[PDB]
Amino acid sequence: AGYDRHITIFSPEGRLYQVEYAFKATNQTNINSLAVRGKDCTVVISQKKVPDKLLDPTTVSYIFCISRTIGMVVNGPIPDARNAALRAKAEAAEFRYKYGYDMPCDVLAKRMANLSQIYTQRAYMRPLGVILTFVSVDEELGPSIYKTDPAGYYVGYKATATGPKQQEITTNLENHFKKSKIDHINEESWEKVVEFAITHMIDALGTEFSKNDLEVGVATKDKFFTLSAENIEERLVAIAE
Amino acid sequence: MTDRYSFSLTTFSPSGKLGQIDYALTAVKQGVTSLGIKATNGVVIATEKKSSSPLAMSETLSKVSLLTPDIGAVYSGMGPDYRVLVDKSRKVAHTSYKRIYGEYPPTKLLVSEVAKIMQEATQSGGVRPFGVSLLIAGHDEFNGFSLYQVDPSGSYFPWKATAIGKGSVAAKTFLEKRWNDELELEDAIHIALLTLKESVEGEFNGDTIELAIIGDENPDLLGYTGIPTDKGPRFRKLTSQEINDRLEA
Amino acid sequence: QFNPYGDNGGTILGIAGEDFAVLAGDTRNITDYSINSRYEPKVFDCGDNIVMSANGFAADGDALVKRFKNSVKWYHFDHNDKKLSINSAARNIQHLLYGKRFFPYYVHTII
Amino acid sequence: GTGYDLSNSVFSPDGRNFQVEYAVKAVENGTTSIGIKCNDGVVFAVEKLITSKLLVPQKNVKIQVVDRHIGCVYSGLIPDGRHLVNRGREEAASFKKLYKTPIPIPAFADRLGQYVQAHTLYNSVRPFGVSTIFGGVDKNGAHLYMLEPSGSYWGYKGAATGKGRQSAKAELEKLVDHHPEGLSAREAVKQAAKIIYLAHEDNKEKDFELEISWCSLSETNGLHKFVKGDLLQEAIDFAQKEIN
Amino acid sequence: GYDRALSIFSPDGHIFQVEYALEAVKRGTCAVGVKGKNCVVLGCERRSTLKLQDTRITPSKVSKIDSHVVLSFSGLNADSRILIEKARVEAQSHRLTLEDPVTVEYLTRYVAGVQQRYTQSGGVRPFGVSTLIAGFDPRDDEPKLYQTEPSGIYSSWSAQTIGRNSKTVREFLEKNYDRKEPPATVEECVKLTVRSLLEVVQTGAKNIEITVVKPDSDIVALSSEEINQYVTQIEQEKQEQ
Amino acid sequence: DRGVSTFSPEGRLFQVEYSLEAIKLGSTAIGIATKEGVVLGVEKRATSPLLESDSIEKIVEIDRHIGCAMSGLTADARSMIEHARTAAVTHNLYYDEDINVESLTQSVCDLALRFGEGASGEERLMSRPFGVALLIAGHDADDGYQLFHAEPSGTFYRYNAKAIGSGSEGAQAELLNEWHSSLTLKEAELLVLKILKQVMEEKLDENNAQLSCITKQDGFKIYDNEKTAELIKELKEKEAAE
Amino acid sequence: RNNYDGDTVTFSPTGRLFQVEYALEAIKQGSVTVGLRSNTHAVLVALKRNADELSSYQKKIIKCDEHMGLSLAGLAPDARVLSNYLRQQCNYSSLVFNRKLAVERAGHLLCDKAQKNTQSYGGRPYGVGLLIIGYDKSGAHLLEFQPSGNVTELYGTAIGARSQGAKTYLERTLDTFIKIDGNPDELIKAGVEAISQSLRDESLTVDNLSIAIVGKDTPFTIYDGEAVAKYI
Amino acid sequence: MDIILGIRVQDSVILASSKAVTRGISVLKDSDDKTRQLSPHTLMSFAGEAGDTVQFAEYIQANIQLYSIREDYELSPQAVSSFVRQELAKSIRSRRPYQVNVLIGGYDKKKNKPELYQIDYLGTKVELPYGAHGYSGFYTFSLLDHHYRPDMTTEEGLDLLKLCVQELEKRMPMDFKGVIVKIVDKDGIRQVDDFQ
Amino acid sequence: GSRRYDSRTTIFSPEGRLYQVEYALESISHAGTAIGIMASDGIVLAAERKVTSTLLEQDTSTEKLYKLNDKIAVAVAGLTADAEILINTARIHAQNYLKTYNEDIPVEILVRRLSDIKQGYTQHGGLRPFGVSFIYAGYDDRYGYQLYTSNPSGNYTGWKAISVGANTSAAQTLLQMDYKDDMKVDDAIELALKTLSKTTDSSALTYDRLEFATIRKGANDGEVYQKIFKPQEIKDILVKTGIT
């Protein structure tokens, strides 16, 4: 009647409306992010929108350090982002304790995907309104991007983008790889990889950025770090040839 | 915490239908087509590796999964429900079989066990049925080769060949008029390659198509030697170079 | 091994006159050959005209006196401030004591 | 269809959770309360509406401490604030027990955030009818946080919630521009007392009592203390001066 | 842990799940019992929905609880089985702990209590059953008959009936049972039972079952022939008019 | 729909309120409290003349000094009576004395309102309120003879006389006239018989109403038919007089 | 007509909790009771309401410890639960700490107790209002408890049917009842006078009058029947 | 030690149980019946630890009586004894094992055969022509091994028993105050009104 | 709260009937038809497979006929999966009985247990009933050959001949016409096939749409044989009657 609309059971068309409305929520923040793989690095750019001048801008982030090697960027409302963030940190540390090695980027995506899948099948759990992009330079796999969503899907990407202008960003990138005919940015330095990542973000949103409009995570072999505005500024200047 | 849904979410309607099961079934119909064929000396299961964005990675999209070194599965419908179901399936093959009899379950038994998990989701409090159908292909020593279909109802049936998802009715008709009981494994692969073509809307190569065989023992895939009584897995996933190579036909 | 019990000495005495009653105790508290205190009384007024002494292991004897005083107060709550009759007090103490039949109060009780 | 606003867990077809937003209304219907991150601490203040003369002055305390170094104030349903602070207290005790150090302010925010967020996951609970302003001093400095019924929280230079938030908000905006060096704790106190008087206009009908607290390294040694006596009087006086 | 209150009050002060349970009783095959001067008879009615029915393996309508007390019901069948098991166990437990068999009243009061509990418990519905419980006390010659309803109310009856058209039979009964002259023989009592039942069931001596309880565990169920002779005898005594 | 423990906009518990409705549907029971004792009567109200009138039990003994009268769904009262009996005896085990009538009644009432679907605290295990009410009669040495009305609202009141069930107000009004502080016990008996005869559907006789009393001397006795029949006759003659 | 009041777990779009508001209403139906305090004492006075002239008058005063007790207006069994839970925390305080429980402290306990029943499904809020008096280490105390979980300390107040008459009286005579220290018989008369502003229309009998006193020289003690004739 | 003996003859089973009950230094009773009737055609004798024996026996009786009413069928002796054997094998691994030994004597009305079952407190069950628990075997088994015939009358079996009890009465230190004798045949269960 | 989504699967309709049971029985009415007939020297079980393609496997498939014992079979009409849950349970119960008593479970006791379980699902736990009806075929030495029926209400009855699933009115009427007490197994086999031939919702009855089983006494007096017929057997016997 009107209840297959409220809880995660099937509609007669075989749909799960609650999942779809959760996907709807991922965009509520109006932020765009994109990720891209270098030779030995992985970059995530995300927009940074601080509206109130009463806010401490150091505390406004949707990029999380999950483990020493794994970065996670969330598109969606902050309290669900933080719920996913905590659970992934817990999971990545547990995994280490039980299995004696670092939880790989993809394994953690799969694990979070399955957790998301559970909420789409049980009536008492709501899905979380987020999309999670995981990055690392995995010891077996290399630079890696894995993404999960409220449906329970999980996929690896050569590169990816998420948010309201995602189709623009994806088309943009698609075109570049189609042209370059390789599955990565053939660049030795992560600085020149974040610069490519910024450029292609600027050229598809049709906006320019200052140093405080952006967030940047870089993943290297055994380290994932987020950039200071001061280093963002440094690449921003370099971008303007 | 406080899971208060202890009542069933699938009930009988006055017509006598189980709504949620019909709807789940419906979600399967709209899923990508996958198929199976039983030959005399092997089984093949196949599906389409429909990439969303070409930025997504083909390998990362597995739809064909080893369950047991002699058992594979593929699906049509909601992929996350499937991934979950695969992991329960592998665990149950150990937990209710390998750890008790010291060998992997025969293919029908593993199937009735996946069927069990699915049935419960059509009856346990607080859950919806799974939105998938599986084809499961295996070989054990006393039943030889077999191919089963399992649905969100918990029902399952053995097939000489079948297909589920979008292009199932066309595929089933085409399969019916090409299946005899004297196909080699190789023939049935070729037929599977044909039948997939019709259902695959666009590009049709080894990187857009997934294929498995349940066939001969691959002692090359064992990883160890020294126990002659232990041969390789009968399950083998074909390489894109392997598919493309015989796409010249 | 840990021993949950001890002995704190003391002797008590209760006599019933035909319209009065006395309950007496020494005030010395000991451990082995040591004197812990020359004044640590162990005969108590628990209201409703009831005096009570629990002599033996002092921790148990304290614990039991606390529980009973507290059961006098709850009796009052639960029965519109009815006076606790001495016989009722006694029967209630039986139950207090027997509650620990397999980990007893190591005391001898007089009221 | 409709009815998405009836259960506490339902996403409406525009990715929203109406029960949280209705909760926000409970917040908005409440007393004004603010926070001011000064240059080595924080200041908390709240408007105690005096419904009648029968209300005993100086009592009925509203600001709460968590551990020894954190101040919490909230607007809305007061029992919901109290519940939240109880949890905060067990969550701070648990932290100190395992880790020995008093809980760092951001960690404490996440603990509160994940708890509040958690009451927007099931329809067997209701969301929190409060917005909370809290914080204090740790080994990394001063911190001010505000947290909504959605579990959303961020760090603030200044913060305000309740009936008069916009007075206070805009008012707080002024100082941010005017003092990039920050304030004296001493200065932030008086500055806070003014803002409650200003934001009082939206409740100007009823009489009111002001309550301030502060947590400052130079002034309280890192401990959250109340402002009382001759410094409270001074800052009340300072508030009366900027009016009439 | 399903504990939804299914049996609740409605504004007129009725409990509709208990009342709908009574409806289930009216539907069931009629049952009757009458008290002799020194016996009790139980009469029931055989379902005439379908034949090809195996008669020797279908559950009879009268159940022995102990060796001196029987129970017959009317209403849901599957429901009655549960009630019967519970009482058979209490019959044994009562003997195990008190070294006496149950009195008929005790056992009635037991069964009654079980039904009552189902009218007041989360997650259960009341019983769609009403029962007649008959026999003699241990070491007693006086006959006992009790009836039980889904609400958990019970009481004693000189004679009584339940189920389909019980209202009719009750009428016959109150106009045929002289409390001052109860059917002072097994024959007089078995006869009066058939007279009541037969005037609702129609000719079928295969549609009727009889069981007779005498003092000291003398409990005997009759074959159709014994019943058919009882049918035939009152066709004649009536066809003498 | 709505909870089994929800409030009406007038601040009343629906389920409690609806239960009081079931109660007014029940057979009448009356109590009168004198200083020579307390009397309880009930209207047996038999469904069919085939029903054995003896088997109707609406006045039960709780302890030797406590009696009970019931009205409503009487199956609901079984477990309340059990808990009351267990309580008076347990109290005697623990204290070597009779439980106060007040306290026993307070213990029964506690048992009510213990209903719901998961009220966060301990266990409110019971789908619905009790649909029956009790007149609890008793004596103790602190408060003499006493009469109580115990409702499913967990509330209880002490009356000097009180009627419940079908035509309580009718009966209650009649009680409000005839009751004074110096009623004899034999008076109170005839009085209960009178007021029952008014409000009973059937005509009054030892076979369809039953009388009882609790006296300090003898405790709680239920009268036999011959005993009651005689008091019917006593009243019939009393009433044929200006 | 409105769909936001079937349980306590639901916010209306205004931001209100109707189930709590309904319980609030149960109180106002309940018979009036008044509390006030000086600096040496705190009095409760309650009008117990009967059902019949054949009935008794509902006890509205409950003793919580030797230094603390309360008056109830509303659904009675909920004052039992609440008061009994207060006897417990008062007891715990004394057994474990040898410390008489602060009147403020009992107030917070009640609030958190009541709050829990307003955020969790399957529960109902408490349908009772309580006024609590006590003498602790910081003098005399009066508290007003609402089932929403709102507790306030006040020099005086009233709750229940026509509560507003007494409450208004108290608001004006405040400069006068707080200054009556060391004279409890008169703090009672002042309490009885305030409660007479809410009678519509009956006279205070000995049977319906209930005073409770607690202070510097007095443990919480409840006066009933003949003991109250003195103030009529 | 308590005496628990049984012998099955041609068409009947005989059970002999000592009548003494001793608590420490006194013989509290000399008229004790250490059997329970399970079915009309099945008898169980028991000996062992003080409280356990009757508790177990009555527990088993209740269960057999409940089965009987539920099915209107009398369970076969072999079935009754498999039930008992499982009940002891459960208890042997429980927190406080029932220390009870039993003989089961029954006429299988279906097979027209007497059957005798011996089971100890730990679940060891065995079917026998004659059996005994405790020390009872040590004195009497040489007698039965000698004189026992599968085709004995009940009279002969009663004589063989009489010998056994005499041997016991002369070589055993304890005075067991004689025995109660019971026979289970097709007509059910009867007690020999006078023996020894 | 969640109370809304609760279908209330165990309540009485105002006429005193159970919605879900009634509705479940409806579900079963759409399922393949199955027949049990008891002869003087055996029991016959025959059933129509609801679904068939030419690609379906005949021998490797079960959906109607299952062994419970070496002495008891069932024919199933309804939800296959719901039947296997109930079948496995029954199989375990029978072994429990065998382990306890060292005797094979009498057919009725097994049948009663299984009906009791169904019965439970209609009285508590808020779950849907099982969408299954069972025909039971078996031998014990108390009653010899027995035939039983059970349905979602938890009700069971004994039969000489009986049908479940689709078109039972047609089938019942047909068996009622031709059934005789003195029937032999070869007769009952034919009567069963022919009853299925006239009730099929399909054009002609072939071997590959049929399942067949028989419970015999065989050559050795004392032992009972359970024959679950191969496709080729069913086919051959189809020829030997007036079909194919």
Author numbering:
A (entry chain O): 10 to 250
B (entry chain P): 1 to 249
C (entry chain 1): -9 to -1, 1 to 102
D (entry chain U): 4 to 247
E (entry chain R): 3 to 243
F (entry chain S): 9 to 250
G (entry chain T): 3 to 234
H (entry chain Y): -1, 1 to 195
Question: How does the study describe this entry?
Answer:
The proteasome is a proteolytic machinery that executes the degradation of polyubiquitinated proteins to maintain cellular homeostasis. In the present study, we show that HPDs constitute a novel class of PIs with a unique mode of proteasome binding. In contrast, we have demonstrated that HPDs act on all three catalytic subunits of the proteasome by direct binding to the active pockets of the ß1, ß2 and ß5 subunits with a similar binding mode and kinetics.
To understand the mechanisms of proteasome inhibition by K-7174, we determined the X-ray crystal structure of the yeast 20 S proteasome in complex with K-7174 at 2.5 Å resolution. Analysis of the structure revealed that three molecules of K-7174 bind to and block the active sites of all three catalytic ß-type subunits, ß1, ß2 and ß5, with a similar binding mode, consistent with the biochemical data. The electron density of K-7174 was well-defined except for one trimethoxy-phenyl group near the ß4 subunit, which was partially discorded. The overall binding is determined largely by hydrophobic interactions between K-7174 and Gly47, Met97, Asp118, Gly130 and Ser131 of the ß5 subunit as well as Arg22 and Gly23 of the ß4 subunit. We also observed that, despite some difference in binding interactions, the active sites of the ß1 and ß2 subunits are blocked by the trimethoxy-phenyl group of K-7174 in a similar fashion to that observed in the ß5 subunit. These findings are fully compatible with our conclusion from biochemical analyses, and confirmed that the trimethoxy-phenyl group, but not the trimethyl-phenyl group, interacts with the active sites of three catalytic subunits via hydrogen bonding and the pentenyl arm (C - 5) fits the hydrophobic grooves between ß subunits via hydrophobic interaction. Three molecules of K-7174 bind to the active pockets of the ß1, ß2 and ß5 subunits along hydrophobic grooves in the direction of the ß7, ß1 and ß4 subunits, respectively. In contrast, these mutations should not affect the affinity of K-7174 to ß5 subunit, because the binding site of K-7174 is spatially distinct from the bortezomib-binding pocket. Crystal structure analyses revealed that K-7174 interacts with ß subunits largely via hydrophobic interaction, whereas bortezomib binds to the ß5 subunit via a hydrogen-bond network, explaining why higher concentrations are required for HPDs compared with bortezomib. K-7174 similarly inhibited all three subunits in a dose-dependent fashion, whereas bortezomib did not affect trypsin-like activity but efficiently inhibited chymotrypsin- and caspase-like activities.
